[PDB]
Structure formats: structure tokens, C-alpha cells
Design a protein around this ligand. Structure first.
Ligand SMILES: *[C@@H]1O[C@H](CO)[C@@H](O)[C@H](O)[C@H]1NC(C)=O
Lengths: 366, 48, 139
């Protein structure tokens, strides 16, 4: 028995979840991810249902709830979403850490000045990192969060924002946001006409080929970003053959030749859970609770001990996924992983390099 | 189509001028070039 | 969450309490959902959240205005994460607005480290420093 929690709108992640379900008993819930209440409710329902692990997404509004409840009830949590700040227990972040790759890339272009557009809903950890490395280098940086402002006024506020970046004439801009937000901002940039030559953009998400680049590709402005799934891999290409085979009527967004990084992370996550329980069976420790779990709000709360042995299992398991080498440390972070550094030319996006935790940056008109 | 391509090349910025030589000028979508700064004029046969 | 639900089952008409930057969204969500009212002395929520009564006023404008009163051009901002980064966003945006040189360091996430920190802030020998933290951290 396991839980899976899906934010309203993540179709392709559920498609990859289902594909990972066939390839290798889930209780599915569809909820507003950012709503703390719905989260708490779902979680407690899963606990009463007696799940050994919970795979789900969270938001910057919901992160603390999940981390706290999982650290208290010793239930394990698997997530494709951004990594928690610091050290939090029983949380397995499928997503790697991009901060060092971003800083190293900024050091690769050797910028002296830049503009940082951060999404609040993504977390300000990245924000904490980049200021410190700026003050260290002599770097000149201007940073602002776009989400607090309402969507209706977004067109006016965005045009205000980019007409602000013409007071300092900032040409080089970084975008730390979900691929969706990235796409919206991109549309606005194309609308103002700031996609012409001399403009430079760095997309600070793992999703570079996931989002549509076809519309800025012809503008002339250079755009670079990060990709976590190389389509030049045998595993990825076999998966892609399968993904081109699938019907769009069953699995939304699954007929396409390309797949978003989040979905890949989900698929790899069910792989990780499967291999973790299998690895717990190889060790032949007892997995199953003694009786019904009871109430999650029970006072005082009863943590099942076996849960800890689950957390360790998930942490100690290592496998080959769409991401690269999948291995976790003691806090649930990815280690010694491959982040492909991508530049965007006229003939489509290209792999200029890659980034490892120990290697740092490694690059390969008439 | 041509408009989309113009927006793609980024020739919808200030100093550019376009004249749409067809009736029902507002039929096509102007919302996407409206914020670009390039001035666009056309002809409308039906006053709302 | 436990306390709140206990209060709800007990049948309270209103709830007065404190929250942290880690706990704010829980309270705002549950109070906006169950329409129970919440009274707090703690920092104000970002944006518009229902059934939350923030006894504490907003200081951002007073800080920016004071910085404009001393008419500083450059300064050092030491912020506490546990308080929320709202003021940090305010002073950063207002930094980018008027030509300010601002260095912001996360002091909240920590004897030796302090002595390292203050000898780090002596690279530009900058004299003016702001401390946005709870009074304990301040002391
Ligand atoms: C990265 O990790 C793998 C183990 O997961 C190891 O085989 C490899 O040696 C590591 N890379 C380097 C450059 O040491």
C-alpha cells in the first residue's frame, strides 16, 4: 500500500506514473497542491488507510506541513518538487540541486551584471545563494519576485518590469521559475520585443527543452538553460520509443516525442520506491505494521518504528533512471548527477556541456 | 500568419509602421502586437 | 494543526495565537477554509488572506523612509529567515529603484562564525548596517 498525491493539472506526471506502474497498490488523490488544508486531509486519509510510503508534489505554501508531518509520523515522502531548505527527515527529493550549476554557469559566461527574476512560489533558497556569490565576485545584480502580483494586472506589471530593466538597460536576465511561468514571461518578452540581438537569457529550471523554444529561437536573443534528461541515451531513447507508441487518449501529453522533466522524475521515483522495497526484502526486515494505523492526529502521536527502516531503504537505494545516476545522501538530496548545459542556436537547442557535483562545469548576412 | 512571423523576428518594436490593407481589421488578433510599440493602422467597415 | 483542530472540536468562536514563517500558511489556509477567525501579534501575511487579523502594522515603508531620511547610498542588510523575506524583497526592489548598493546576508541560519562574519563585512569597510530580526537575535 502506497499513496500518491497529484496537484490539479499534472497530467503528464500521472502518465509517467502509470507507465512506471505497468513497467514495474497506489491510492490516487487529486488536490489543490498549494492549499494546506486539502494536503493535511489527504495525508491523514492516507495514514488511516495504512500506507507504507507517500509519493506526491508540494508547493512553497505546503512544504512545511509535509516536512513536519513526515518528520513526526516517520512516514516517508517522495517528491519531484524542489528541495527543502536545510535538513529535513523522511523527505526524498527526486529533484537535484541547481544552485551550483547556475552559479557555475554565471561564472562561465563571466557576467559582470545581471537581472534575477525569481518565483516566490518556487522558494527563495536559490535567492539566498545567488546574492552571496554576487557579493563575493564583484558581480553587479538586480533581483525581483513576480508572483505576488495578480494575473490580470500581470501584463501591465510585466511591461512595467521590463521598462524598469531599461533604466539600467539590463540585457542579461535570469529566470528562476516553473516552466509554465517561464513560458508566460517568455510570451511577454516576445510581446515587448526584447527577444532581439544583444539580449541574453538564462532559464534557471531543469526543463529547458520541455518548454517551447520555437518562438524565441528566431528572435536572435541568445538563451541558455539546463536539461536533466538527455535524449541521446539508450534508456531515454527506448523510453521515447515507448512514449511515441502510447495513446494520447489514455495518458495525456504522452504521444509526444519529448517528455517534461517532472514526469521523468515521477517515473524514476516509482522505480526508486520499487527498488527500495525490493532492497528491504533482500535484507528481509519486516515491512508491515502491526495493526490499523489509527488516527494521524492521535495524542500523543504513535510513530511506527518500521517507518524509519523504510526511510533508510529509500535513501540507500541507487538506480539508473531518465535523470542519470540516481543516488541519495542522508538528507534526501541527489548526489553526483549529470546536468546537461544547453545553449539555444538557430538550428535548435544544443548540448554545450554538463555539470557534476565534483567536476563542476565541463564543456564539450551578406 | 505574417504578423506572427513579424513578432517572431521582433520587428514589432518602436519605429516600425504597418498598414493592414483589409476590411475587418479587428477580426484578426491585435492583442499580441498592441504592446510591441510599432504603430499599426488599418480599415474597419463595421463600427461596434 | 493539532492544537487548532482541538480548539475547533472544543467549539471556539475565535482563536488568538502566534505563528512563524514555517507555520503561517497552515493557519491562513485553515482559517480561510473553516471561516474561524484568527488574531495574531506576529508579522503580517503577504497579500490578501481572509480571517486573519494582524495586530502588527507594516514596517516596510517606515524602514524605506528612514533609509531615505539618513539618505544612505550603500548599506548592509542582515535579515532573519525565520521572520520572512518580505522586508528583504521591499528593500531590494527599492534598492533597484533608486540606485542603492545593498548586500544582504542570511544571518538567521547559523562565537567563531560571528567573528568571521563581521570581518567579512570589512572588505568595503562599510559602516551602515540594518538588522531585521527578532529582538533576541538582535541582542
Ligand atoms: C559518480 O558516482 C558513481 C557512483 O554512483 C561513481 O561510479 C563515479 O566514480 C562518480 N564519478 C566520479 C567522477 O568519481
Amino acid at each position: 500500500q502506497i499513496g500518491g498525491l497529484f496537484p490539479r493539472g499534472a497530467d503528464q506526471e500521472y502518465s509517467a506514473f502509470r507507465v512506471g506502474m505497468v513497467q514495474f497498490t497506489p491510492h490516487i488523490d487529486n488536490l489543490e497542491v498549494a492549499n494546506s488544508f486539502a494536503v493535511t486531509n489527504a495525508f491523514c486519509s492516507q495514514f488511516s488507510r495504512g500506507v507504507y510510503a507517500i509519493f506526491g508534489f508540494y508547493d512553497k505554501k505546503s512544504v512545511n506541513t509535509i516536512t513536519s508531518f513526515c518528520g513526526t509520523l516517520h512516514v516517508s515522502f517522495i517528491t519531484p518538487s524542489f528541495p527543502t531548505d536545510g535538513t529535513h527527515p523522511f523527505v526524498i527529493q527526486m529533484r537535484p540541486d541547481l544552485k551550483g550549476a547556475l552559479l557555475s554557469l554565471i561564472e562561465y559566461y563571466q557576467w559582470d551584471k545581471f537581472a534575477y527574476l525569481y518565483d516566490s512560489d518556487r522558494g527563495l533558497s536559490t535567492l539566498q545563494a545567488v546574492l552571496d556569490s554576487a557579493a563575493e565576485k564583484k558581480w553587479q545584480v538586480t533581483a525581483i519576485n513576480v508572483g505576488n502580483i495578480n494575473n490580470d494586472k500581470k501584463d501591465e506589471t510585466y511591461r512595467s518590469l521590463f521598462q524598469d530593466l531599461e533604466l539600467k538597460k539590463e540585457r542579461r536576465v535570469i529566470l528562476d521559475c516553473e516552466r509554465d511561468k517561464v513560458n508566460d514571461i517568455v510570451d511577454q518578452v516576445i510581446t515587448i520585443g526584447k527577444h532581439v540581438k544583444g539580449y541574453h537569457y538564462i532559464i534557471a529550471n531543469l526543463g529547458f527543452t520541455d518548454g517551447d523554444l520555437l518562438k524565441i529561437q528566431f528572435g536572435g536573443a541568445e538563451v541558455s538553460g539546463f536539461q536533466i534528461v538527455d535524449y541521446d541515451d539508450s534508456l531515454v531513447s527506448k523510453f521515447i520509443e515507448r512514449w511515441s507508441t502510447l495513446e494520447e487518449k489514455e495518458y495525456p501529453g504522452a504521444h509526444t516525442a519529448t517528455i517534461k522533466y517532472t514526469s521523468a522524475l515521477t517515473y524514476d521515483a516509482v522505480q526508486v520506491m520499487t527498488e527500495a522495497f525490493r532492497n528491504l526484502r533482500k535484507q528481509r526486515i519486516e515491512i508491515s505494521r502491526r495493526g490499523n494505523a489509527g488516527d494521524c492526529l492521535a495524542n500523543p502521536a504513535v510513530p511506527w518504528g518500521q517507518g524509519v527502516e523504510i526511510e533508510r531503504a529509500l535513501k540507500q537505494v541507487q538506480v539508473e533512471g531518465l535523470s542519470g545516476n540516481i543516488k541519495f545522501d542522508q538528507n534526501g538530496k541527489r548526489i553526483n548527477y549529470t546536468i546537461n548545459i544547453m545553449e539555444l542556436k538557430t538550428n535548435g537547442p544544443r548540448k554545450i556541456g554538463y555539470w557534476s557535483e565534483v567536476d563542476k562545469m565541463v564543456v564539450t548576412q551578406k
